[PDB]
Each structure stands twice: as structure tokens, then as C-alpha cells.
């Protein structure tokens, strides 16, 4: 017949190989494909859906108090409210997001992030915040006067209720000091009427943008191990 | 794999993983055979990836890897891995009549060979497997919650075909399952809390943050730190 | 306006036979509220024309059109996440026993989230915007509208054994006003779309 | 020659494989194909031939008394005669039929069934029956008045002698309480002349229709194990 | 298999089944060889399927699976499976001259190899095998009923080619036969009663219903229940 | 190279197989075919002689 010879690497089971194999049941015809809503073909479709940051990543924030930052009429005129360390690799506010969970299955990420802050005070609550983006390696500001040398915007949340803050292209695991910051200072005080509550809250979101990229897939550090009824399958 | 993206749901999920690892003893005295109900709930690394989705449609590429060790010379044994789907009868014993079944697909392989490999097709009667089922199996109130009867793949029964010998050797059967032709619908939040069982989605959380019940992310000192 | 009763698409899907809103009881939202949930079609199986179609036929196939409306003054604050969860297999807290029939099938009254931070199934509320969802920020809007397609691997299904969609209303920012004793009602209206039934 | 390497799954004997193999006798020419009547190419051709139900599935019906239901002049005006549980999976009237035996070689069936009831009284025997189909999960009726809310027909067996009752598409093993019922009530009494017998019988048939389907083949629960002369072949 | 229907008579019947399983001992003292007349009457699961039809025309794909076990190291033995058709002489002993026959097709295979596999062609002199024969074999009244002389496939004789050794090992020969190119005529009722012999279609029935003589289906209380 | 797998029936010696095999002497050219009278191509030619 055909003269053959066996190469080095015959008979091995590489777990990542892509060959066909013997169908254990031929002529079993599976149930044909019905149209089910919301098919995911690419995990970058999931990563671009916005999801809440825990910008209240502290003790004494029990459960859902971690998802919101309270601003009040007793906060100072130029007080620092919160800062968001731009760590997808490290456990921070971005860990339990759709952009933070899917990216921990991969080793190298690269792309632009998209932060959205939504003000959740009353209709007549008025004030100004100033959201400052600090590039990696730059100094995280402490005063409102210092935070003018970088990319910052002044947000009057009487006019708007939402603000999109495009974080520029980072390229991710090229640094391996921090990978960036987003801080927020009071500009004015919180001005509420007497019937409104004097404490108002912010919700932060983050999504990836269209230039986002994930490669060199690993297993996630988040899950890991007992399981009850694990020997019921045997 | 060979896409462009590496985040394709085919690329994200078609990746061979040890779904089952059980040794079973074999001797001349009269379980002496391997049996495993085919699911993915057993290992939490593959489980959390497949629980990112609500509906999954895939073929299953089983790869039985069999080692033998002494309790001189490792014997060359013949094994039978037999896929018993849902609706057929399973062997209760190693020498039962159900191993002789014409209709249950068996495979006969040696320890000296490369590992046995089959592709189990899409075995559901619906158009996708229900990773999460918000319902009850039986038409009574005694049914279990979260268990779709249409969702079971089958059983993978593995025995040693050889007759019983006085020698002492333990046979370890590693089963590697690798999904193929994955179609996936309706993505879900990734699970933060640790699993309590494989039969359900109960939650307790860890004692302290991270992944605690009231604190998923580990804390910092202040919000302004 | 559908039928005689008068008052966005999930995944880009529009479902295409009797052809109206079933206004559920208004729930009352306060500062201590954790959330509310209604499983569909379990919330509608004991009500009206849909309930007569469920209890006399054997298989159902229908989409849903949900209007949540939260009516408050301009001195109230707070945000709701009105999110529809397909196949919301609930988990029970701190036990290995699966939730019973009473813990899941609550009827028209619906349920309350015990731990809404984890969506009562060990997942996260932060990532719960991967589902079809809308926000009710009382600063900005007071209503939400979610279209729900036929979400099933099966072609038709059992209404008394399985609930495909779960409408969840979770207060992310709690209800606030100066004298913290105020309530804000939330009214849920569910209209079934393309009510196909078989097995009379 | 050709450089090769052995994949995982070489040397195995899958019992369901479809490869060719070595002909043990080449140039033996088998007897060529004569035309024999009644070739079966598909087992759904067998499943569509009508065959008798045992609608008298009781004790004291010995042998062929199980195949027929007797109606008499002493039965009540609205008495229940028989009900047929639509179980192909479970042992009932449909077990030993052509649609019931071939389908127990398979796990999932789906299609419409076709029941035929044939009245076998005398020529001048007259009366009305009412055959009621109950969908799965519905209430099996006990009175003739109750059985009007479902699919029912009124059969005057003076006019006709046979009735076809199309059972609608079930989809079979989707339920895994019952999968349906077919009941029969007396409407009138049995009217016979004085020379005719006052007891008349019904024969029920069932076949599958053209939309019937069988998949995921298994081995039948009906046969199973001594065999005499089994060691004569050795 | 690869049809559309899964109820094709090719798909319904071409399915490998253990038609013969007999160990035979082998030693240095002077049956020490395997011999089996090729039929399908031996196992009732395959028998009832083929007895759904009156006439069958098929090739037979034999697969000899051979294991060895101790009564250190399993010896690599050479076996000879020799198909003796109807009309040729069969070996009476393991060392007979009939194993050296030029015209009886043998196959020489090792225990270390993949299992031996041949295809026996359609061996009948008529155009189909008679699954049921309503007649007598010989032209006398001493002929047996239901045995067509044209219907016999042949014999499958299996021996160990190696010379006799003092070691004690039992050789088990599983024979797997899988029909091919099945054409089938004149379908029949499926058998309800249990078989009594393999030579004929005698019937006794079970003691109680189901599958009893006077009650094939198990009873219910009343017809109106 | 080419990914292969061994079928059941590899390494066996069926006595009735029809494969080619290794010529033990290549470039040995046998004596070419002369015309010899009375060639038999079919054994039914022999069976028809009285």
C-alpha cells in the first residue's frame, strides 16, 4: 500500500489539538437549530456592555452600599470623593464587572475603556463635580487646584445626569506605578431644597470600547477549590 | 482552533478539561467498574465558564485516558467504555448483560493504545441545553428545582473486559471532555460566590472579602485612598 | 394601547391567536426595600383571559411586554434597575437544599430579593446589565418598558412547571427624601404578546 | 514515504463505526438480487400499518377476548365503555401494536396517531357511541355530559361501521400527567332485533400517520433473558 | 451510518452485537479451539429484530475480540480465525490438517493488535436468507422443520497458532457481527412470547401477564379504569 | 504529517487478501513471455472437453 513512517509526536494526546473523531452515534439526528434570542458569537460582545463599578470599595459598606458613592451637603468644597484604580488584573472596583471578569480569563488585554457616572439625586439637586483622569505613572492628585494639568472635565450635575469619560488606549499588560486613575473632586457644594434629601448618590459604570482585545487565554483566578452531591453522578 | 479573535465562543469554550477522574479496583473477588453521569458541574473552572450562558449547544469530545499501577510488569488490559444515553439501561455490575447491548455504543481500547476518543453528538431534544432551568422536572410538587429532564447527556460506563486475575492493580480512568461546535445564547453575570452543591445554585459566600456575601471585592481603607 | 385596558426590545428581537395589560398590584418602595421579582408566566397564570388560556390548554407560547412605572414627586430620589432575567434559577442562602415549590412559584404577589447584591443566585447585581434592562432614575425618568421574546430552547413549554423570564426591580440607590418616611409606588403592567396555546 | 502520526483513538473498536473491511472471500459472487415482493426500506413503513389494540386489557379476558370490547343491551345509557391510555412507552393497550413495538426500539417518538374503531355487531344493530379525545394533562371524563369540552365525536354505528379518530401531534417523550386518553361512552342503548345477539363487539386499531418520527435507537424492553440447543452451534 | 431517517432498515439493523462469547483453555496436555456455526439465533435481542422480517440479504462483518487472563505477564499469542463455509471440512482438533487448508480463508492476528475484522459476503444460493422457513430440509419425513439447508453461513473456527506451553492462561474470544448492505422483505409481527429454543419458534409464554400465553399485555383493573 | 488512526484489522494476515508487496529483486527482468500453445485462461474451458 502506502509506505509510511511515524513522526515524533504520534500517539500523544495534546489537549489543545483540533482533529475530528469518531461519532459515537451516527444517524442520530440532533434536534435542529431553532432561533433563540441573543446569540453570543464573540466574548467581546459581552465585554462592551456597561456594568456597575464598586466605587465604594470599603469596610462598613455592606452589600449594595458598595455600588454607590454618597455626596452630601456636609462634604467640603474641594474634597476628594473617590478614586478608581484602573486595575483589571488586580482586585479593585473593576474586578466584578463584565470587562473585569472576562478579561481575567486572558493574560494580555489592550483597548479603551468607557466610564459612565450617573447622578442619582433629586431633580432639584445641583452642584459641580470634576472628574480627573490620570495616565499611568502620573501623580494621583489630592487637591482640586493640582488636578488641572491632566485630562479632566467639570460636570455640573444639575444640567446633566450622566457623564461618559473615555479612557484612552492603555495596552494593558505592558507595565506588569499603577495602570491609571480616575479621581473625583467636589467643585461646589451639593445644593438641595428643603424637601429633598441632603445626601445624593453616584453610580459608576464601565464598559470596553470597540478597540478592546483579549489574548493568551488562561483560567480565571476568581473561581477555585467542597461540592455537595458531587459523587451522585457516579 | 484557528480564528482571528481568540474570544470567539468556540475558542473560549472548546478546550479539553478533566471532567472525571476515578480509580476503581479490580481483582478476582466479587464498584469494580467506572460509571459517570455526563455533566460539567463537577469542576468549578469549567462550570463557571459554561454558566456564563443560559443556553448551550455543543458536541462532546470524550477522551478516556487510562493508567494502571501496582498496589512484575504493567498488564496490557482491554477496556470497554460504553455510552448509555438517557432512556437506555445502565450496567449494575461489571459482568452484567448490559455490556453486551447491541444498541449502546461501546468502544474497546487497550492501555497500550493512544487514548480512546469519541464524539457524543447534541443529545438534547430541545434546540439547546438549559444551563439554567427555572422550573421543576416532574409534574408534581415533589420535583426537583433546576433539573431539566431533557438536559441529561447520558452515562459513560467503563469496565475492564478481561477476566478476573489474582494480581493487584489499580486502574485510573481520566475522562477528558472537550466541547465542539459551540453555539451559545443569552449571556449571564459571572458567579462571584463559591458553589455549595452541583445540583443547584445555592450560595453562602466566603467568610471575609473578597467573594464574600456582603462584599465581593476585597476592601480598601477609604474611597479616597 | 393593547386590547381594552389602557395605561425596548430584548436582544433586538420582535415576536410575531388572541391579541392587553394585566396591571399587577402596586408594590410600595421605601428606603429599606431590597427588591421585587415576578416570574413569568407564573405571575399571570391565575389571572383573566391568559389564566383561562393557561388552565384550559396544555402548552403556551407567548412573548411579554412589560411596563414598569414608578410615580413620585420631584423631591424624591433613587434609582431602580428594572431587569428581566431569562431562566433565573434561584439559589437558597446558606443551605444545600434546593428552593422548594413555595419559594419559587409565588403567583401574582411575586417575591422579594433576600440578597439582591448577588441577585439571589450567587452571581452579581453589578453585571446584571448583561440582561435586557432599563434604569428608572427618578431624577430623570419614571417608567421603563422591556419587550420579552419567546426565550426557550423548546418550541412550546409548560406554564405550570417552568418560568422562562423573571422580571426583577431592584433599588440600586435607595429611596430618599428629607423626612425619611416617604413611600413611592411602583406599578407593573404585563401584556402577553402572540398568545399561542395548544391542547384544549 | 508519507510521514504520519497516530491520533488518539487509533486501534480502538467502536461498535458503531462505519468503515470498510477486508472481504474474506473475493471473487465469490453472491446470488444476484431477485425481485422479492414487499421490500421494506424504512421502518416507518411498518409503523403506519394498522393493528389491533387490546382495549379489553383486564383479567378474565383470556387470549383473544382482550382484543374486543363487548357492548350489550344491559349497559347503561351513558356508561363508560373503555378508555385507552396513550402510552407507547408504558405497557398498555398500545404496547403490542406495530406502532407500539417498533417505537420501543427508539427513545424519542413524535407524530400523529390514527385510531380506527370497527363495530362488529349484526346488520340491524343500532346505537350511538361518543368517542372523546382528551389532550395530555386534561381531566379524563366520567360522565357523558362532562365530555363535551374536548375533541369528541358522536358515532351512530347503525349508519357507519368504522370511525377514524385522528389523534393530533403529540411530540411523545417531551413529558416523560398521562400522554392523553381516548374514552368511549354510550349515548343510546344497543338496539337489536330479537333474532340478533344482544351483545355486540368493537375492535380498535391504531396506526401512525405520515408525520411520525422515531430517533435515538435503543434496545427493546420487551425481549430479554434459557435457550434450548444453544450450544449446538459450538 | 449517515442517513436522514434513522429508521432505515440499514440503520435499524447494521449495528455490531456480541454474537458469540466462548473462552477455551490452552495448555501443554492433549476443546482447545473455538468453533461456532454462524447464525444470529443465539442472542434474543438481535434475533427478535431480524425475525421482524421474512427474507434478509446482508454481508456479515465479523470482529474477533480476544482477551487473555491468568488462571508474570500476558503472552502475545498468534490466533487463526478460519471461515469454513457450507460444503467444506471443519477442523476436529487444534493441530489438524484442516487449519493448513489453502481454500478456507484464514486470518492470522495477535492479541496485541487491533481486533481482527473480516467481511463475510452473502453466502446463500438463493437471493435472500430465509429467516423463517415453512418447510423441511431433507427429502424424507425425517427432515427437521424450519431449517433451510441453503441458509447456513458457515463456521468460524478459531485456534491459537502457537505451540503448547506449560503456562496457564484462558483465552476468551468475543465475536462481534455487524450486518451490512441489508435488504429486507415481508415484515412480520414482533414476537411477544419468550423463546424456548434456537432451532424453532416454539412458545410457552410467561406465567403471568405481561407476555403470557393468554395475556400479552399486563392487565388493569377494569376497562373503564 | 498526515494524522492517521489504525482500524480494527490492522496487522492481520488474511490469506485471501489482494494487496501488492515488496519485490524481493527489483531490476531482475524475467524472461519475456513467449507464445506457448494452448493457454488456459478460465477453468470452464477445461470443463467443456468431453
Name the grid cell of E142: 425425517
Name the grid cell of E198: 434456537
Asked if A29 lies within 8 A of E4 by C-beta distance, the reply is: yes
Nearest-CA neighbor of B103 among D218, C134, C198, E8? D218
Q: How far is A40 from chain D (nearest CA, A)?
A: 27
In chain D, the residue whose alpha carbon lies closest to the alpha carbon of F11 is D11
**Phi, psi of D122, deg, nearest 5:** -80, 175
Name the grid cell of B148: 431539566
Touching subunits of F (3+ CB pairs, under 8 Å) are A, D, E
Q: What residues of chain B have any CB closer than 8 angstroms to a CB in chain E?
A: 72-73, 75-76, 78, 100-103, 108, 112, 161-167
Contact (Cβ atoms closer than 8 angstroms) between residue C120 and residue C113: yes
Nearest-CA neighbor of A24 among B177, D118, E90, D37? B177
Contact (Cβ atoms closer than 8 angstroms) between residue D12 and residue B116: yes
Name the grid cell of D133: 379525545
In chain B, the residue whose alpha carbon lies closest to the alpha carbon of E17 is B102
Residues 6+ apart with CB under 8 A from C118: B192, B193, B203, B205, B213, B216, C124, C125
Residues 6+ apart with CB under 8 A from E96: none
Task: Write the CA distances from A163 to A70, A154, A155, A166, C70, integer angstroms.
Answer: 17, 10, 7, 10, 24
Q: How far apart are CA C14 and CA C2, in angstroms?
A: 16
Q: At what resolution in Å was this solved?
A: 3.0
Helix (H) or strand (E) holding A111: none
* E strand spans, chain B: 17-26, 34-37, 53-70, 78-85, 105-110, 116-120, 129-130, 154-160, 169-187
Q: How far apart are CA B173 and CA B23, in angstroms?
A: 6
D142: alpha, beta or left, given left = phi > 0 and alpha = psi -120 to 50?
A: alpha
Asked if B166 lies within 8 A of E68 by C-beta distance, the reply is: no
**Taking CB atoms and an 8 Å cutoff, what residues of chain F touch A1?**
19-20
Q: How far apart are CA B161 and CA B99, in angstroms?
A: 10
What architecture does CATH give domain D1-234? Sandwich (2.60)
**Taking CB atoms and an 8 Å cutoff, what residues of chain A touch F4?**
4
Nearest-CA neighbor of D110 among D51, D182, D178, D169? D169
Sign of the torsion formed by the C-alpha atoms of D62, D63, D67 and D71: negative
Q: How far apart are the first and last CA of chain B?
A: 44
Q: How far apart are CA B220 and CA B209, in angstroms?
A: 10
Q: How far is F12 from chain E (nearest CA, A)?
A: 5
Asked if E113 lies within 8 A of F15 by C-beta distance, the reply is: no
Contact (Cβ atoms closer than 8 angstroms) between residue A89 and residue C147: no
**Phi, psi of B154, deg, nearest 5:** 160, -165
- Residue given cell 424424507 in the structure block: E140
Touching subunits of B (3+ CB pairs, under 8 Å) are A, C, D, E
Q: How far is F23 from chain A (nearest CA, A)?
A: 13
Burial label, F4 (beta-carbon count in 10 A; 0-12, 13-18, 19+): middle
What CA dihedral angle connects B127, B130, B134 and B140, to 10 degrees? 80
Name the grid cell of A173: 499588560
Q: Please tell me which of the candidates D14, D174, D219 has its beta carbon nearest to residue B103.
A: D219
Burial label, F2 (beta-carbon count in 10 A; 0-12, 13-18, 19+): exposed
Chain center to CA of D206: 5
Residue C76, helix vs strand vs coil: coil
Nearest-CA neighbor of C92 among B143, B201, B48, A226? B201
Topology at the third CATH level for domain C1-200 = Jelly Rolls (2.60.120)
Task: Write the CA distances from C194 to B171, C15, C44, C54, C64, integer angstroms.
Answer: 57, 7, 15, 14, 9
In chain B, the residue whose alpha carbon lies closest to the alpha carbon of E45 is B102
Is C199's Cβ below 8 Å from some Cβ in D? yes
Name the grid cell of A176: 506588569
Nearest-CA neighbor of D169 among D112, D120, D208, D124? D112
C126: alpha, beta or left, given left = phi > 0 and alpha = psi -120 to 50?
A: alpha
Residue D100, helix vs strand vs coil: helix
Q: How far apart are CA A68 and CA D168, in angstroms?
A: 57
| Pairing of the two strands D22-23 and C77-86 | unpaired
**Phi, psi of D104, deg, nearest 5:** -80, -5
CB neighbourhood size of D67 (10 A): 19
Is C161's Cβ below 8 Å from some Cβ in D? no
* DSSP classification of residue A61: -
The b/e string for F39-50 (b: 16+ C-beta within 10 A; e otherwise) is eeeeeeeeeeee
Instruction: Please calculate the CA angle F35-F39-F45 and round it to the nearest 5 degrees.
Output: 160
Q: How far apart are CA B1 and CA B10, in angstroms?
A: 8
A167 DSSP β-pair partners = A113
Q: Where are the domains of chain A?
A: 1-234
Q: How far apart are CA D198 and CA D121, in angstroms?
A: 9
Name the grid cell of A20: 475530528
Q: How far is B158 from chain C (nearest CA, A)?
A: 30
Task: Write the CA distances from A207 to A47, A57, A202, E136, integer angstroms.
Answer: 7, 19, 17, 85
* DSSP classification of residue E89: P
**Phi, psi of A202, deg, nearest 5:** -110, 140
State the residue range of the domain holding E178.
1-225
Touching subunits of C (3+ CB pairs, under 8 Å) are A, B, D
A71: alpha, beta or left, given left = phi > 0 and alpha = psi -120 to 50?
A: beta
Q: Where are the domains of chain C?
A: 1-200
- Residue given cell 505451540 in the structure block: E163
Interface of C with B in 181-200 (CB under 8 A): none
Q: How far is F46 from chain D (nearest CA, A)?
A: 19
Is D184's Cβ below 8 Å from some Cβ in E? no
In chain B, the residue whose alpha carbon lies closest to the alpha carbon of E69 is B163
**Taking CB atoms and an 8 Å cutoff, what residues of chain C touch B200?**
89, 91-92, 96, 98-99
Q: How far apart are the first and last CA of chain A?
A: 46
Q: How far apart are CA A222 and CA A111, in angstroms?
A: 22
Burial label, B44 (beta-carbon count in 10 A; 0-12, 13-18, 19+): middle
Chain length of chain A: 234
Task: Mark out the alpha helices in A32-89 (DSSP H runs).
Answer: 44-47
In chain D, the residue whose alpha carbon lies closest to the alpha carbon of C198 is D135
Sign of the torsion formed by the C-alpha atoms of A61, A65, A70 and A72: negative
Q: How far apart are the first and last CA of chain E?
A: 44
**Taking CB atoms and an 8 Å cutoff, what residues of chain B touch E172?**
162-163
Q: Please tell me which of the candidates B73, B101, B108 has its beta carbon nearest to residue E65.
A: B108
Residues 6+ apart with CB under 8 A from A64: C116, C117, C125, C172
Residues 6+ apart with CB under 8 A from A90: none
Q: How far apart are CA A126 and CA A161, in angstroms?
A: 10
E199: alpha, beta or left, given left = phi > 0 and alpha = psi -120 to 50?
A: alpha
Asked if C58 lies within 8 A of D137 by C-beta distance, the reply is: yes
Task: Write the CA distances from D148 to C50, D152, E56, integer angstroms.
Answer: 22, 7, 50
| Chain A contact probe: residue of E1, E8, E14, E182 with most A CBs at under 10 A | E1
Nearest-CA neighbor of B89 among B74, B99, B76, B79? B99
What are the respective helix, strand and coil percentages of chain E, to the nearest 5? 10, 40, 50
Q: How many domains does chain B have?
A: 1
Asked if E170 lies within 8 A of B163 by C-beta distance, the reply is: yes
Helix (H) or strand (E) holding A157: none
In chain F, the residue whose alpha carbon lies closest to the alpha carbon of A22 is F5
Q: What residues of chain E have any CB closer than 8 angstroms to a CB in chain A?
A: 1-6, 8, 11
Asked if D150 lies within 8 A of C200 by C-beta distance, the reply is: yes
Contact (Cβ atoms closer than 8 angstroms) between residue C199 and residue D136: yes
Name the grid cell of A7: 513522526
Name the grid cell of B64: 478516556
| Chain C contact probe: residue of D86, D134, D135 with most C CBs at under 10 A | D135
Is D227's Cβ below 8 Å from some Cβ in B? no
**Phi, psi of C56, deg, nearest 5:** -110, -20
- Residue given cell 462483518 in the structure block: E61
Residues 6+ apart with CB under 8 A from A147: A130, A132, A141, A183, A185
- Residue given cell 451490512 in the structure block: E180
Residue E21, helix vs strand vs coil: strand
Q: How far apart are CA B76 and CA E73, in angstroms?
A: 9
Q: How far apart are CA A7 and CA D62, in angstroms?
A: 72
Q: How far apart are CA D160 and CA D202, in angstroms?
A: 13
Contact (Cβ atoms closer than 8 angstroms) between residue A7 and residue D6: no
Nearest-CA neighbor of B80 among B127, B47, B32? B32
Contact (Cβ atoms closer than 8 angstroms) between residue C70 and residue C142: yes
For chains C and E, having 3+ Cβ pairs within 8 Å is answered no
Asked if A46 lies within 8 A of C96 by C-beta distance, the reply is: no
Amino acid at each position: 500500500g502506502v509506505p509510511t513512517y511515524l513522526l515524533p509526536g504520534s500517539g500523544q494526546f495534546l489537549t489543545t489539538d483540533d482533529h475530528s473523531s469518531a461519532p459515537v452515534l451516527p444517524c442520530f439526528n440532533p434536534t435542529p437549530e431553532m432561533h433563540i434570542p441573543g446569540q453570543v458569537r464573540n466574548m467581546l460582545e459581552v465585554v462592551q456592555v456597561e456594568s456597575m463599578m464598586e466605587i465604594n470599595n470599603t469596610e462598613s459598606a455592606v452589600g449594595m452600599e458598595r455600588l454607590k458613592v454618597d455626596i452630601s451637603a456636609l462634604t467640603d468644597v474641594d474634597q476628594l470623593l473617590f478614586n478608581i484604580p484602573l486595575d483589571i488584573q488586580l482586585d479593585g472596583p473593576l474586578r466584578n464587572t463584565l470587562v473585569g471578569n472576562i478579561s481575567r480569563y486572558y493574560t494580555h488585554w489592550s483597548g479603551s475603556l468607557e466610564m459612565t457616572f450617573m447622578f442619582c439625586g433629586s431633580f432639584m439637586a445641583t452642584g459641580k463635580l470634576i472628574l480627573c483622569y490620570t495616565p499611568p505613572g502620573g501623580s494621583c492628585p489630592t487637591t482640586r487646584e493640582t488636578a488641572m494639568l491632566g485630562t479632566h472635565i467639570v460636570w455640573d450635575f444639575g444640567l446633566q445626569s450622566s457623564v461618559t469619560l473615555i479612557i484612552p488606549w492603555i495596552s494593558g499588560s505592558h507595565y506588569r506605578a499603577n495602570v491609571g486613575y480616575v479621581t473625583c473632586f467636589m467643585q461646589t457644594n451639593l445644593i438641595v431644597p428643603s424637601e429633598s434629601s441632603d445626601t445624593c448618590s453616584l453610580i459608576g459604570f464601565i464598559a470596553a470600547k470597540d478597540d478592546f482585545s483579549l489574548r493568551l487565554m488562561r483560567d480565571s483566578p476568581d473561581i477555585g477549590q467542597h461540592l455537595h452531591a458531587a459523587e451522585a453522578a457516579y | 482552533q484557528h480564528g482571528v479573535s481568540e474570544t470567539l465562543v468556540e475558542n473560549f469554550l472548546s478546550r479539553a478539561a478533566l471532567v472525571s477522574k476515578r480509580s476503581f479496583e479490580y481483582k478476582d473477588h466479587t464498584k469494580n467498574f467506572f460509571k459517570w453521569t455526563i455533566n460539567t458541574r463537577s469542576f468549578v473552572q469549567l462550570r463557571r465558564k459554561l454558566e456564563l450562558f443560559t443556553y448551550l449547544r455543543f458536541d462532546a469530545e470524550i477522551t478516556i485516558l487510562t493508567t494502571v499501577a501496582v498496589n512484575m510488569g504493567l498488564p496490557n488490559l482491554t477496556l470497554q467504555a460504553m455510552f448509555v444515553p438517557t432512556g437506555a439501561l445502565t450496567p449494575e455490575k461489571q459482568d452484567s448483560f448490559h455490556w453486551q447491548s447491541g444498541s449502546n455504543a461501546s468502544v474497546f481500547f487497550k492501555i497500550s493504545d493512544p487514548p480512546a476518543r469519541m464524539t457524543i453528538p447534541f443529545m438534547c431534544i430541545n434546540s439547546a441545553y438549559s444551563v439554567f432551568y427555572d422550573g421543576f422536572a416532574g409534574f408534581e410538587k415533589s420535583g426537583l428545582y433546576g433539573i431539566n429532564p431533557a438536559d441529561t447527556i447520558g452515562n459513560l460506563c467503563v469496565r475492564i473486559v478481561n477476566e478476573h486475575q489474582p494480581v493487584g492493580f489499580t486502574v485510573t480512568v481520566r475522562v477528558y471532555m472537550k466541547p465542539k461546535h459551540i453555539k451559545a445564547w443569552a449571556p449571564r453575570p459571572p458567579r462571584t460566590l463559591p458553589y455549595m452543591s452541583i445540583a443547584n445554585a445555592n450560595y453562602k459566600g466566603k467568610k471575609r472579602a473578597p467573594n464574600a456575601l456582603n462584599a465581593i471585592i476585597g476592601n480598601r481603607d477609604s474611597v479616597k485612598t | 394601547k393593547l386590547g381594552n385596558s389602557a395605561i425596548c426590545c430584548a436582544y433586538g428581537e420582535w415576536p410575531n391567536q388572541p391579541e392587553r395589560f394585566y396591571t399587577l398590584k402596586s408594590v410600595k418602595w421605601e428606603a429599606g426595600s431590597t427588591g421585587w421579582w415576578w416570574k413569568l408566566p407564573d405571575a399571570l397564570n391565575n389571572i383573566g383571559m391568559f389564566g383561562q388560556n393557561v388552565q384550559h390548554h396544555y402548552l403556551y407560547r407567548s412573548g411579554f411586554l412589560i411596563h414598569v412605572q414608578c410615580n413620585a414627586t420631584r423631591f424624591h430620589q433613587g434609582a431602580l434597575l428594572v431587569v428581566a432575567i431569562p431562566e433565573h434559577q434561584r439559589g437558597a442562602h446558606n443551605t444545600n437544599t434546593s428552593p422548594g415549590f413555595d419559594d419559587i412559584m409565588k403567583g401574582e404577589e411575586g417575591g422579594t430579593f433576600n440578597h439582591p447584591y448577588v441577585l439571589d443566585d450567587g452571581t452579581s447585581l453589578a453585571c446584571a446589565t448583561i440582561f435586557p434592562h432599563q434604569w428608572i432614575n427618578l431624577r430623570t425618568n419614571n417608567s421603563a418598558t422591556i419587550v420579552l421574546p419567546w426565550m426557550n430552547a423548546a418550541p412550546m413549554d409548560f406554564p405550570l412547571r417552568h418560568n422562562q423570564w423573571t422580571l426583577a426591580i431592584i433599588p440600586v440607590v435607595p429611596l430618599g427624601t428629607r423626612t425619611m418616611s416617604s413611600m413611592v409606588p411602583i406599578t407593573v403592567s404585563i401584556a402577553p404578546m402572540c398568545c399561542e396555546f395548544n391542547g384544549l
